[PDB]
Symmetry: D2
Subunit: 467 residues, 4 copies
């Protein structure tokens, strides 16, 4: 699993010999990848979310927990007991799939809404057979009333759960399968209605149920810990300012962060331990991203003793030891005296963290992609497979075996293929990473292996008529 | 208290001698009042909500409970402990007041938004002094971002609580009173922000907190029970159909209704007890009024064994013993084979039950006004006071003593005066009752005293040029 | 016609002997009718629109002109030539009818959306026959996508035109009549589509076509002139301020107003003529009511030499001889130093002038109802007919002949009956007049016959339980 | 000028010797450029707009005409006479600029809203000086209330006009320059207000003024004619279907198209002339793109004899010689029995034609970029200049002269630089072309030089971690 890769790298001590780093940064696994050039010396503030960037949740343990609690919630509100026999399977869901609430399919699409993979339950629908429901092998992906795009890591159990349910109702004799849902005499459950229940249940688990409590009760089981995290953060604070802006509330943030910094030392072995808050020039919780990058909400102050909000809108200045709640990205800029391009924001939400901070504020962006830590291994190991496909393509271009090679390549990633492509065709997610993430990597810790004023470089882009 | 009046009438046995009823209906206390003529023989369906029509909550016990739990909730989220020393005072709030979130005032207004009473906390602001904040002694009451109209019985504790809070912060030395809220150094709590917290807390208490549980745990303390309720309902079912459409969920509805019908007999003394559901041709919960009278929500079916919803949209026909959830007013009409003017709908929400069913569907309407049971007593007893005002008015009209008489009249109702007027000026609430409630009374039980095919009558209306 | 009544009164000289006025005001024809009490001494500003209050358009000449030009426009865009044989008929349309774009009917309804009259083309649909399309004999009149309410005087030709068209297509053999429109082989014209064309054509005629030009080219034919208008306005300016706020542009306003004041004298015979602008403390054109009573538009200044707008938002103060364009009702209040209840606004639009200024700003209101000048004559002459109906009603109430009496009464007003009622049932329009017009009359000139500080009086209102 | 290039190519006879074409297609000027691979053999329908694809308007004559009429319109509504001394200057505007209505600047930006060029009037604001108004040298370009993106060819005069006006008011002593507009005593004209007037005037000229009439009165002066247009269209009709979908009305379309086909021959010299409509399997006018690619409008049929719409929604089938009006892209698909990827749509609106048909329907797209015909010449001629910049960049990257080289390169395109870049940075427009236009060229006629089943090819895309 990708978190196993991350954990193994996490257990390593960080030898800060520059000659070691310069050659350690070269390994693809520890590389920072570059979509648009970025001069690190111009970055004056380093900003973070917490989800899967600071707090790396262990896979598949965390997904299974969320899956299990979501299933229990559905059963709790009246779904059949048989749901309880579901068990999370990490090999099925690929992140970034689109659930079609009309026909109950999971779709993998490219940036233009072309179908690359279609599955109904666990049945993979071949090209011709998809044309009945998708005449142009295409969806309008911004039709948000019909399509839901599962591009978060938290979406992974939900992704698998949707397929389990379609599979279950399809094969349960009590039900009759219809085009848009399931009939049970005088009851009709549409896929849309089903999807809404799943949505509700997942949200409930996350914010009202026992997920956070189960998580903090057993942090060693659910959360990766890395001694290098305080090291990197302390190095960032030497050359600029460091801030936290998370959607989580203070109570959860404090529990998780305390754990993440729980070593018998500070930044480096031998140094005194320091509380996690001391690593940040500004701490902001209840961020409500992506709204945060627009109007946001009123700026509040957290009573860190009680973990409740103080009464009133906070109107004061940045003060040492203060914790903020809500506000907006402008809050950060004002308090830290920064401009957007002075900021490198590090996050795991392609939409809510990266796309939005880039498009709305022109922040510089770093996207953490936890799966990359494994997708790389598969890509480098089965490289020959892709290289063959490329050869088969350019040969045919200058003129069905391609489909089999496509299939065999994709299956090494999972049943839903790579996060980034299906054979030679890039996914929507891949196109969004390239377009909005200035930098990306399996972990932001990979920044440790690059010098203070490194210039990350991407090739200039030319139009076809310019080439 | 008005519920004491209702309780005393409730304890009475119903002698169905027609000569007794014809003369019993004459007492103002047991009368049904008429705004627009209504032939009862044309009514084919009698419909009900549950809140304060079937389930008469005891005053001030129920209001105090809701007040106490709301205060605890505010303290729970970080308001000062001193809130706990508040105690509900039934003499202060009159229903139907407008809270101005800009300036933190409770206002009593007429149908045209003219100010009749203005109070800041417990300080009553005289006419001239209101002109500073209300230059035209007027508000645009449909500006719903600024003004919140507290016209439900459930709104009564909230009404008092808002004044308590304004009073508390005004007189708490830790705070500085500003035009639009309270300053505490680097914190500023606007009245708007305060109001939002109170709104949230009240909603939470009602739907997530312990109000329903505290209520059902001690029904004798909190809910009026009347042996005449099953009698009247059984008489309605003889001449037409009877339905329930409540916003409450089934579990609460079943608890309350079971209690309301808990006598050692059925409709009449000596008869076998019958379960409450047998009194209804159609039972619908989770109604989501007022949306119910528009598009509504999808029609669901309740699993009455588990109190959970069955899976799927219910597509079947009206069946004996079925309980519905959601749907819309059209559901009722279709299933009962009724047209709007065939329906007399009985409710306690001037907006959500009465105004909306009238305007959206042309239903006939009966408004239960629990306070009337006391307001009448005050009106008939202090009649001379009003009669004097009338004389003082027509005398001046054909030409400040009026203000003192106005004051002394209004104080007999409470500090916020009558629900229906301030001196000679009618409230917004009164104008809405007249406009949208075809019939009204302190209790719908008053229908018992009228014969099967009574013709309720109001005088025809003439324009001034027609007179 | 009503404008004949107005013209006859207009030709009269105004004898300002107070004994004459006090007894002249008594004639119903010259009365100001009162819905809510109004002390004239408290009014500090008198405000006017121009349409049918200052500029009384002659009937049926003006309606016929607008009708003719609208028909020509429809033919111009491709409707059949046969339309040209239509001719305006003042006896058919009553103001305030609702056009149902689904079924192509004109409806007369009460305040609650109950059907009083239904006509398809020129065919009057009896009660039972309407139930097929209107099961509850009711419409939701605020469903503005389906229903259009024709309550302006300018709406009168459009009202008749809609019926002409439904009649024409119904009886033209080239077309097949369907429930929602007309079929012509591969073409289907819905009533909705038809209605939209008529709407567009009417708007075009009014703002881009030759209506205004045809009007100003022959003012004597199209506009009533009254020597008493400058007299009354000059008397208003003695005791307070006078303003104009019209939707018309300056060029049209100046043409019309110049004509209205074109006498060889000023306020009184023998006095020097004064230009119309000198009668106003503030002149505002392009008002864009009803938006005017909300946010309005930016305040502009008219270059009265060129009749074009000066460049820029006007930021200066009230200046003598300035003409404003756009702005909002707040503009008036600020510049004149008035509060809403200091203002009596006189207009002919029940919605755009009266309802909106009342509800949004708490202005005092005077509604001019030109038809009243004839409706009164019919009401007073055929009084016995109504009196019979009243007797027949109370007799039956204490127990189909009523329907015949209803019919015979209504036909004296026109085919669509009185503006104010159908038999004993009040129209929506009547209920709106009572609710929002503080005062009303056939002409605002009727104010001339009342003294400076008259107290207009309406009886106090009592609820049924208060009576 | 670019239209001179197009005209010169237009005058050439088309030698259809395949060996000539294969080597003629190679010249960059006659090339079709490829962003995403496209197999022409899969294309079953060729679709067209008319603006600048079929009807190539001569530059700068057409822009000057539109400019002149727009200026006259502004003067007509009250702008100062001095405007009349403006004269269109083709060297100033580059297409695709953003007008900032807050500060009155024209901006050239990249895909991420970074400022590349800023001009206030004709004053070019250097980098540091822009930071006062643009702290992050960035705009949120989708803030459509503030920013207007001038990316159409019709936008070119408006672009120049906005700068003329800012220049004029800035230097006219009667006015005082403020941050957000111009003061003239009691008048304030904001740049926003000014921009709205210009918008209105341009729209008026285009749809109510004399632009279309002036154009059709002298087609030889304003419109490029090419004998190869009927040749290519006839070749397209051999292998698939051909349709027209334009926003223009039929009367204008017929005038223009008749002219475009006015030769003494048909497809090839010597052949009989054929009317323009015979080249199309489907003709649709009043398309209302981009709405056309969503819900569209109701499908109408044009009476081609009168040029007016027939009465009714057209419900029939595709018929020979029928002309449609409105409808939606689904209309095309249904009538032609096509799926989106079967369609190559050729247009000149990057947003309304290309982006929308691609994103909403998955059509294949061909973008005509008239300026390319000159931008290429500048690019190939001054190639060394760009090559130097590239060298200076990679040298510095591996380490202000760059700025001077950037400047000198950009000035060869105009004062606002290349449509596609500023030095090494690509414009928003360039990024949109690459993302949404599958193919592009200076003229669609360039398709003539490619064989029936050509495979247009673009290189597969790889992520940085995949490289």
């Amino acid at each position: 699993s990708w978190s196993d890769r991350l954990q193994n790298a996490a257990d390593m001590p960080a030898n800060m010999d520059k000659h070691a780093l310069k050659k350690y940064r070269r390994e693809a696994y520890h590389r920072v990848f570059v979509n648009r050039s970025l001069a690190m010396e111009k970055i004056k503030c380093f900003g973070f979310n917490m989800d899967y960037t600071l707090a790396v949740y262990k896979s598949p343990e965390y997904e299974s927990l969320g899956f299990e609690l979501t299933v229990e919630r559905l059963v709790s509100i009246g779904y059949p007991q048989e749901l309880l026999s579901f068990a999370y399977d990490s090999t099925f869901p690929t992140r970034g799939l689109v659930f079609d609430t009309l026909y109950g399919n999971l779709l993998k699409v490219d940036a233009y809404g072309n179908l690359l993979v279609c599955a109904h339950g666990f049945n993979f629908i071949r090209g011709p057979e998809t044309r009945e429901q998708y005449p142009n092998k295409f969806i309008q992906r911004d039709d948000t009333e019909r399509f839901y795009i599962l591009n978060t890591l938290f979406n992974l159990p939900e992704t698998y759960l949707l397929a389990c349910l379609v599979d279950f109702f399809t094969n349960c004799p009590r039900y009759t399968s219809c085009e848009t849902g399931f009939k049970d005499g005088d009851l009709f459950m549409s896929y849309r209605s089903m999807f809404q229940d799943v949505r509700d249940a997942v949200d409930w688990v996350h914010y009202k149920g026992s997920l956070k409590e189960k998580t903090v009760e057993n942090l060693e089981k659910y959360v990766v810990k890395d001694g290098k995290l305080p090291l990197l953060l302390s190095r960032m604070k030497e050359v600029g300012k460091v801030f936290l802006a998370t959607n989580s509330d203070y109570k959860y943030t404090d529990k998780i962060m305390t754990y993440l910094f729980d070593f018998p030392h500070g930044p480096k072995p031998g140094s005194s331990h320091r509380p996690w808050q001391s690593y940040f020039d500004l701490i902001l919780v209840d961020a409500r991203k992506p709204l945060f990058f627009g109007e946001g909400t009123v700026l509040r102050q957290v009573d860190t003793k009680t973990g409740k909000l103080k009464i009133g809108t906070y109107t004061g200045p940045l003060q040492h030891g203060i914790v903020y709640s809500g506000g907006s990205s402008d809050t950060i800029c004002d308090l830290l005296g920064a401009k957007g391009k002075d900021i490198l924001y590090i996050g795991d939400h392609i939409f809510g963290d990266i796309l939005k901070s880039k498009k709305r504020q022109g922040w510089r962006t770093f996207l953490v992609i936890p799966e990359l830590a494994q997708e790389l291994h598969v890509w480098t190991d089965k490289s020959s497979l892709f290289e063959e496909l490329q050869s088969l393509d350019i040969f045919l271009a200058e003129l069905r075996r391609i489909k089999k090679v496509t299939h065999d390549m994709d299956m090494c990633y999972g049943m839903m293929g790579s996060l980034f492509r299906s054979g030679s065709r890039q996914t929507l997610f891949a196109s969004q990473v390239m377009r909005y993430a200035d930098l990306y990597a399996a972990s932001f810790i990979n920044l440790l292996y690059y010098p203070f004023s490194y210039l990350f470089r991407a090739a200039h882009v030319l139009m076809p008529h310019e080439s």
